Design a binder for this molecule. Structure first.
Ligand SMILES: CC(C)[C@@H](NC(=O)[C@H](CS)NC(=O)CCC[C@H](N)C(=O)O)C(=O)O
Ligand SMILES: [Fe+3]
Length: 329
């Protein structure tokens, strides 16, 4: 009935080092995975994912409805017109099980020129009361830069895998302007589970989130140990096995655009599973004005006539389109 995706485990630790041949061997594995199912697990990544999951669980399980309204994005609180991305994403008991908290670049302050300029997709993060959530903001901001660092190394692997110099992507991935986001998603156990929160796929599978390509350059995802993701292949959807020690990596549609679809953005979905679990993506977005010139690694001259795409416009459109297609999360 349902087969299992080949998701290789790639030791990415050489990407933090200066052994250039070893980096090329990592890049080959990234190339192979990106041309197959489009997913791999980054292992030996150096991030303390036990603390990540512990601190995230403490937050999800202690925040109150009052705090959720106070932090809610505009979709749940009309008072918060500036919160299109960052803030709390409320569940709706009986209708919607998932809930989450999204935050952006901590360097987006009122001082920041993009905030001053009111450029779309830039927002100042909102946070709960420190005394009610001691150490949470400090943990979350540290994690942002921890996973930023891992992502910068992965981008070197992707650049080398495509035959470019290692900073081809990472040079656009900067702490002062990155539009990257962290989302701390809670998927709850519920008995009874609300039928309204379960979607039925065309092929009959019960889903929590429908098929989509990622709005990102790449996505760097930690999940707890409950299998749920499926990737689409020509022979149908295949189960991605869980690994709560590694990061699940895949290309987003910005990468597919700039590589002339040589590295596709894999289509994937979330199966419905009645289990308490965590889904913690880091979406590797560039700066608002970042443009990468497309190329076609299939051609000798590498030439593409695809239009260079400004990352900010891509992100603003992608996030709205994803809400329209797959629902406000
Ligand atoms: C693990 C993923 C598939 C996760 N889904 C997701 O994160 C889905 C699909 S990639 N992503 C989104 O809704 C986009 C959130 C963007 C964020 N608010 C921002 O402003 O940057 C899940 O578990 O549902
Ligand atoms: Fe996704």
């Amino acid at each position: 009935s349902v087969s299992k995706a080949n998701v290789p485990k790639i030791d990415v630790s050489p990407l933090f080092g200066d052994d250039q041949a070893a980096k090329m061997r990592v890049a080959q594995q990234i190339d192979a995975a990106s041309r197959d199912t489009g997913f791999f697990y980054a292992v030996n990544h150096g991030i303390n994912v036990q603390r990540l999951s512990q601190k995230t669980k403490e937050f999800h399980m202690s925040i109150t409805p009052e705090e959720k309204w106070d932090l809610a994005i505009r979709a749940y609180n009309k008072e918060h017109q500036d919160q299109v991305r960052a803030g709390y994403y409320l569940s709706i008991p009986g209708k919607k099980a998932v809930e989450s908290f999204c935050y952006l670049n901590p360097n987006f302050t009122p001082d920041h020129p993009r905030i001053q300029a009111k450029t779309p997709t830039h927002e100042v993060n909102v946070w709960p009361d420190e005394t009610k959530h001691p150490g949470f903001q400090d943990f979350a901001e540290q994690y942002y830069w921890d996973v930023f660092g891992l992502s910068s190394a992965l981008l070197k692997g992707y650049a080398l895998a495509l035959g470019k110099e290692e900073n081809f992507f990472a040079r656009h991935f900067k702490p002062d302007d990155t539009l990257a986001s962290v989302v701390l998603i809670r998927y709850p156990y519920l008995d009874p589970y609300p039928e309204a929160a379960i979607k039925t796929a065309a092929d009959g599978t019960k889903l929590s989130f429908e098929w989509h390509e990622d709005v990102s350059l790449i996505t760097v995802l930690y999940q707890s140990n409950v299998q749920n993701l499926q990737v689409e292949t020509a022979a149908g959807y295949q189960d991605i096995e869980a690994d709560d020690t590694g990061y699940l990596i895949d290309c987003g549609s910005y990468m597919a655009h700039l590589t002339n679809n040589y590295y596709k953005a894999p289509i994937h979905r979330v199966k419905w599973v009645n289990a308490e679990r965590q889904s913690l993506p880091f979406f590797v977005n560039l700066g608002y004005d970042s443009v990468i010139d497309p190329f076609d690694p299939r051609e000798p001259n590498g030439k593409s006539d695809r239009e260079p795409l400004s990352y900010g416009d891509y992100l603003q459109n992608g996030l709205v389109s994803l809400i329209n297609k797959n629902g406000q999360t």
